[PDB]
Amino acid sequence: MKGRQGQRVRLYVRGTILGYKRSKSNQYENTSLLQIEGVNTKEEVGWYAGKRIAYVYKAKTKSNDSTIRCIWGKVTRPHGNSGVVRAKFRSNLPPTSMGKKVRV
Amino acid sequence: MGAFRFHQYQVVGRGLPTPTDEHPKIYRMKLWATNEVRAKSKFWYFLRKLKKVKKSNGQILAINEIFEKNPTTIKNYGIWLRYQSRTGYHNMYKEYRDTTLNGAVEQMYTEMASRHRVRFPCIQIIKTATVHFKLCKRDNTKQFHKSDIKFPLVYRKVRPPTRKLKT
Amino acid sequence: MKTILASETMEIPEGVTVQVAAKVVTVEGPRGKLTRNFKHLNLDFQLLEGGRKLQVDAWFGTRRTMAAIRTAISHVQNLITGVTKGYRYKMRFVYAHFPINASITNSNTAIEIRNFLGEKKVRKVDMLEGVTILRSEKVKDELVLDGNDIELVSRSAALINQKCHVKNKDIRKFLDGIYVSDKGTITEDA
Amino acid sequence: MVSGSGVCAKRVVVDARHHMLGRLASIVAKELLNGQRVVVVRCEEICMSGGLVRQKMKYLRFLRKRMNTKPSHGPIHFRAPAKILWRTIRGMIPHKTARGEAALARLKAYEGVPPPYDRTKRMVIPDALKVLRLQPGHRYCLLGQLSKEVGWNYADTIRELEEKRKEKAKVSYDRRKQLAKLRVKAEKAAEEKLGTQLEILAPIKY
Amino acid sequence: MSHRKFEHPRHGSLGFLPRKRCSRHRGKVKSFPKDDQQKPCHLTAFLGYKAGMTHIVREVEKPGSKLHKKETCEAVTIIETPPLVIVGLVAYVKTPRGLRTLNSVWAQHLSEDVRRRFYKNWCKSKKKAFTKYALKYDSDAGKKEIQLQLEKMKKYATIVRVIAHTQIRKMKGLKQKKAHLMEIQVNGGTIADKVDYGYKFFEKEVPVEAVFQKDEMVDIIGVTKGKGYEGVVTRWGVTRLPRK
Amino acid sequence: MPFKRFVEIGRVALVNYGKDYGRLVVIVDVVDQNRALVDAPDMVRCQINFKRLSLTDIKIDIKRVPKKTTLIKAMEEADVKNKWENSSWGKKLIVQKRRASLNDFDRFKVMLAKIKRGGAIRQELAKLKKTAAA
RNA sequence: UGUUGUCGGCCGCGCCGGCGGCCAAAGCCCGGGGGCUCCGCGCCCCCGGCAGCCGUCGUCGGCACGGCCGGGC
RNA sequence: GGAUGAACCGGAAGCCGGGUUACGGUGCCCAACUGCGCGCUAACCUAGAACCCACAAAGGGUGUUGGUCGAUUAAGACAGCAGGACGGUGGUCAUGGAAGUCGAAAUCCGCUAAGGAGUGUGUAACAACUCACCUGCCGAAUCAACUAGCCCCGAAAAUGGAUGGCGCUGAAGCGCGCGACCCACACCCGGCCAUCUGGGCGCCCCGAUGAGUAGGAGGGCGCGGCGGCCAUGCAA
RNA sequence: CCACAGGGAUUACUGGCUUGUGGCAGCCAAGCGUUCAUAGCGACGUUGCUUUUUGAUCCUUCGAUGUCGGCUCUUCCUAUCAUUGCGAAGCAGAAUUCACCAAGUGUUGGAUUGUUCACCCACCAAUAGGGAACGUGAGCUGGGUUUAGACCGUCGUGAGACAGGUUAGUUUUACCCUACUGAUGACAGUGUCGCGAUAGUAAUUCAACCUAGUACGAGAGGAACCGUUGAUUCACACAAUUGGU
RNA sequence: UAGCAUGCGACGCCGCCCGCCGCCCGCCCCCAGAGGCCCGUGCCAUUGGCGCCGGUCCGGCCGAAGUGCCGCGGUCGGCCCAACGGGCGGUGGAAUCCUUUGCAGACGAC
């Protein structure tokens, strides 16, 4: 049909953001450090390089900023390789938007 | 079978009623459904349709299903049928090729929907009738399958089968 | 939707060879060559031993597919007949007061009609394929158009007749032209 | 399932040959929004499903609309297949916002090949056409069959398509003749290949 | 209706619009006659300057109507058309972005003509020895560079065009001394022969007599007289409005 | 594609998904032109309407009609077809599976070492090219 | 003053397993009879012993993770 | 949520935080499925609960699918092609004239294996050819009729094209089932503000409900001069 | 003769809704057309579409939407009057009659009347209809309507009144924004020559000759295609000539 | 007819430039009906003996621009800063105005 070869692709999947570092004086850009709870398999991190993490910016749920901004980054590289990974965000995030569950 | 299609529910019952020498007398009318949730409802359509009762002047004794009846295996079901389209309900006598009682409903719901146009509110059918393979009368898919059982023709359309990849 | 389908096979006659490549078929016999493309749904077109059998087959069928297969078989029969036996349409000039003078320009392969209905401007249209026109004048009556390819011969025949149409008054009134007198044809010795 | 065309950190070349125009545009708009810099190549060879007359009327209602009503300045209509694809992208992206306009400006559509992007173009995960006009399934129309009925840029584009295809066919034919030679001396030196203790556990993982 | 009523063709054309300043003072052709005749002896255009108008008597020709055979007046524009220097051969490529020039081969002699070409054209009015135009290479080092350019050009099949200019000091009535630069396409037979003839035509001047025959049908291209700014009646041909 | 659909035996088919979580199957009983019963020797039988389950090239040697014992016998006769199956056409998954098993120490040293040698082979291969070349 | 590990509470998650409900049963092997098709294959149905394992209700049993908030022995 | 939208849907809101959901939605714009099993449509139908807002009728349609019933079939059909039809008697009426063939009786049989007082073409009228029935060639289904779906048709308007847009077509339409997901301030959960339940020592604590114009009822902030108390001021 | 407070809580009035009325269409087809439902004509009945007449409503404005008609100037629709290509005929030619596709270009000049509308006259290929706030007053015009003066008729005791007629009876503003027409005009390594994504549209129609006093036709009359000439209308341009200044 | 502000080409190219490099300071962050250093000290990192890749001299093919790649013979090298830049430094090779006018023109422009 689809000719399943395929690959797999599944949404799962939650993770948490450890903390986002926005630094300058003027040489560095920005870092975000990410922890998926268990997930991607050593094979499925490795085969890949290239996770998109899309997190909805959903009311969470006092009155939140409910906006039509869903943000999706890309995972650069493991640093943590059997767990934790480095990530970057391209728009830049919401407020202190550290914490909130990360998903694909 | 996996995520239903319509297991027929054998409801034996009553009609439990009054201090007069009367009482209602016995029925099944054997109805195809998904478990009790359809039954309860199924009875009020049977009770409105045939006898007129109430809701309360139907009482239900027990329910028995049917458990893989057919063993996977086969018949091309004759169905006597009602479809609601551009007015009320019109009769149809459909005899179609299928697997089973699970499949017959869907092939009817899809053919009453496409073929007959039917949209939601609709209730089901009147009956479903096994028949023998040589007997199956009218028309296209089933006639070919009847011929396949004959055989020669299990072994015809392998003749596309084995003719996608190549020999 | 569905329904279902099967193979049809045609014997090739001894005076005809066939060769198939891609979905183009070439049919060749002593009246000449004919090359046509049979692209269609789920449907393959092949020569099962050249000099034996042309096969058309498909693994999928419906009322539309069966119509296309029926057109395809008529086209191949038509090709087989054209390469051994030829096609002819035979066509007659009619003029009811003004002599119409029709002839062939072999260079720029075309048939040109002068003094059509008193028209100063010559009417011409080509000849498609290696179709041949003979004008066997006599009074200046009979035109015979012969070829292997029916499609291209017929377009050429239809075109000569088409060349004469006038639509401006009176379907009844003006019969000046060249009209198809055949359909077309047998083959032959003599 | 995994989308096998999609992310690369930088690439981005897309083959449009007998791909479905709105399906290809949808992934391209998503890659552009992600911050990719997208080059669609072979825009003349891209396909749209549907019967020619009904595709021809849609564009034609724009062509009568090209004329009037008049300041000048736009509403505007592009005759040619890359620019038809660019018109498709400038509806796919939210086309009133700086994030969308900045995504639009990261797209290029090129007709034939530009002068050489000889890193291969890649197919989009089943974007491609054959079936999506289904066998039959009525007509399809190529953008280079649409734009012959709408005009140049097309016409030059299909003449440059022709030359770029003819020369790269010739250059392919001989590079393949040397590649086959290299393959045959490579396979014999894997048939041979010296020995193992560790080494043949890897080809027991093909 | 609505209105009204008594309805008119609309004054002054829309294919002749924008009614606006032309970008440069000297006309520019966007397309040419087709290659259907002799090689690039056929330069596809020539230039002159309009002197005025005069008038002619001719022995005519036609025969269908009443007045015939015989003497007639017909009206004439005189142009001074001095011989014009085809300076260089410009090599245009077909690309799917339009034509692109590749390189240009130059004669040994434009030399007041390029100083005039640097007068609006470029700017500042030519007094003590300036603007500058580059000098030729060492001769046959530069001719082999040029003939290596000819090789690429005459293998890849360039749509041949000519840079030419009017050597204006051959006119008198513009008392002016300045050259006017133009792009003229060269049209003819086969493309290699067309490059060869264009080469043999830049290494010496061309007169009117080598591009147009007497009687020949010529399209003439110019820029109209300027008025300045106007209202609608004398700019689009609309009515005056009447009451006293 | 509308494809292969049918009604015959011998033709192995491979999965375009379901529950199970497996799976490869061959069609035992044939039961119009949509519905068919697919089974396997060491796999569960199912009757599906299965457009979108596609059949592979390699075909196994049986005739029409199979109950369970008969099917088993056929499988025994064949086998070999499963190997083609481990490899190739549909089929593939045992060579792939050999892939997935590998992000693991012992497994990682077997890999550097395939690599290390692979290099020695590149170097020999390269020397050969140099002698061939000029 | 900022951060990170955690113990306790709350909620989410996926996966595995058992028993009873449909007197359990698809089942298969063994054994007996009937029918259709009467061109024979093949199809069907029923009954006893028996590997076997099924889709669904209910219920219980086992694990591993995350988020948020706080600091009974 | 519905493109926008006083009154449609979800929902009734203190503030915040997190979790899960409702309505509705999951090709891109836009988070989240280019989801599964099946079937219909190719018109760009068509992306639509409701709306002045989203039109489409009477009537028609061998488009296509599907259901059914009757009759006809290898005691050979339906169609096509080909082939057989003497005589009573140029059928009785009527009328210039029917005489097979204006109109109207009447439709039998000898002689026969088949062979109707005839199906359409004729000349003023007279002039021939085919055909009922029967047969061959061919070989398999045919015909009649009800019912239903979608589509098609009916279908013309004013500055410029859209179902919100790109715009799809074995779907990104439609219907019948189904799986997983998304998504509010809702609901839960955590911490906290009023009133009230009250409780306990001028103060602390437990739990519930708690948008708001007109507006009632009540606590408080600020202005300016006065008095008693109580200070501040060479930097007010 | 007016004045004041207000109201779009309520009219005239433009707009919006409706669409009975109006315009146009489909269906059915009694019937008429010598015979013939469907060359044409076509009732009753019936379903619609438009929104451009009229009516209805009272949503919008009464701290103000300038009136009718006209003119000029831009643009559009199609239910097409002509022109192109068509089909039918009760199409012999031939004038035509009805209808199909089709909005590119055309669709005029005058006499009465303020008129719109309409009547009339010669023209013409034909002198189509319908929208754009009844397009068009920060353009014009100002004849009607619709102030204050006055007459007549009718009504009223009278002031005064009439969808009754008549003579006279005013047209403000220096453009901030926006719109377009037209001229300027930075960034970028420079001027110039260019390309051409794309944006505007240019040619319309007639008469006559060749053919031919032919075809077709009892006759009377009376065609076509190209091939030729010229001119109506529109566009661009120049100014030797002729004409103005 | 208009049209480099489609964010283009070419031609012609110049009171100090710029061609080629030492040393330092900011921005993004493979090809592909499976594949992609011999002896050593040393926790490291540094740091030393000694076939396959990376700039190079010299040239060709898509290239017709922008733009790239791939080879006969050797040299600096291995088993941070590409696309941009911003300098401390070495070695080495024009136009507006003006004045008078117009084919041009309200000014500006031409």
Side-chain angles (χ1 to χ4, degrees), chain E residues 138-196:
Chain E
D138 187 14
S139 186
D140 308 313
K143 284 281 192 180
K144 186 53 197 162
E145 185 272 304
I146 277 164
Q147 296 298 78
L148 189 64
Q149 304 283 36
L150 172 57
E151 280 186 62
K152 211 189 192 220
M153 191 188 303
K154 193 144 78 160
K155 284 159 191 178
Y156 278 90
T158 291
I159 182 170
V160 177
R161 305 217 174 155
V162 148
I163 294 295
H165 93 274
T166 59
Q167 201 180 89
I168 228 168
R169 188 77 280 172
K170 302 168 174 163
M171 186 173 25
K172 309 89 195 158
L174 279 174
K175 295 180 62 184
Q176 137 175 193
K177 295 98 132 74
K178 195 206 74 256
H180 283 86
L181 208 74
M182 61 268 187
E183 171 278 284
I184 309 174
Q185 191 164 288
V186 235
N187 291 88
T190 193
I191 205 95
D193 202 351
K194 120 176 277 186
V195 174
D196 184 74

Side-chain angles (χ1 to χ4, degrees), chain D residues 22-196:
Chain D
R23 172 49 197 78
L24 183 144
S26 188
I27 193 167
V28 165
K30 188 52 182 288
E31 286 203 71
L32 293 165
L33 284 168
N34 299 338
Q36 292 302 328
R37 292 60 46 167
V38 180
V39 187
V40 184
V41 185
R42 314 162 79 169
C43 301
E44 71 295 344
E45 296 195 59
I46 208 166
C47 285
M48 287 170 99
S49 210
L52 202 115
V53 195
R54 117 210 280 117
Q55 288 290 20
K56 185 135 64 183
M57 81 82 193
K58 152 163 171 175
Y59 294 112
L60 183 59
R61 45 161 165 155
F62 230 115
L63 231 186
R64 199 171 189 217
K65 218 240 78 37
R66 135 273 135 188
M67 184 179 159
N68 43 50
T69 177
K70 304 165 190 173
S72 53
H73 307 119
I76 178 265
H77 213 61
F78 296 98
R79 296 156 169 260
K83 295 157 271 280
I84 288 287
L85 176 58
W86 195 84
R87 176 62 278 232
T88 279
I89 229 73
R90 218 331 184 98
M92 291 245 178
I93 306 171
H95 43 271
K96 290 99 170 181
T97 183
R99 197 197 74 195
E101 229 71 276
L104 169 71
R106 295 162 204 166
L107 181 61
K108 297 183 178 180
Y110 289 142
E111 288 127 312
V113 61
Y117 293 168
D118 282 359
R119 190 274 139 108
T120 193
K121 308 92 217 57
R122 78 173 188 188
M123 145 285 315
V124 173
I125 9 75
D127 213 293
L129 232 229
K130 243 180 179 181
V131 188
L132 261 61
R133 69 177 186 78
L134 320 168
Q135 49 137 63
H138 300 262
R139 306 82 166 181
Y140 71 108
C141 189
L142 214 74
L143 286 190
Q145 288 168 191
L146 196 186
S147 52
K148 56 136 167 58
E149 319 197 305
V150 189
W152 25 260
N153 132 12
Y154 147 77
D156 65 55
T157 266
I158 276 210
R159 173 44 59 218
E160 289 279 292
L161 166 72
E162 251 195 56
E163 312 324 305
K164 281 23 203 178
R165 299 286 95 108
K166 289 175 297 201
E167 288 311 303
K168 285 287 153 74
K170 184 196 301 168
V171 173
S172 196
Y173 201 81
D174 271 60
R175 89 203 297 112
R176 175 198 62 121
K177 284 158 58 196
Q178 191 61 356
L179 183 60
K181 226 94 90 295
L182 193 280
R183 281 260 61 97
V184 172
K185 77 82 47 257
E187 80 199 21
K188 271 66 232 186
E191 190 170 68
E192 181 187 5
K193 72 143 252 58
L194 198 160
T196 183

Side-chain angles (χ1 to χ4, degrees), chain A residues 1 7 13 17 22 32 35 39 41 48 52 57 59 72 74-75 80 88 91 96 98 101:
Chain A
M1 185 149 204
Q7 211 191 134
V13 60
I17 154 158
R22 54 259 298 269
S32 189
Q35 188 178 35
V39 124
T41 232
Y48 216 31
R52 272 192 299 257
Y57 205 76
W72 65 93
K74 182 220 186 270
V75 122
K88 231 183 76 169
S91 186
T96 194
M98 164 177 80
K101 296 163 170 179

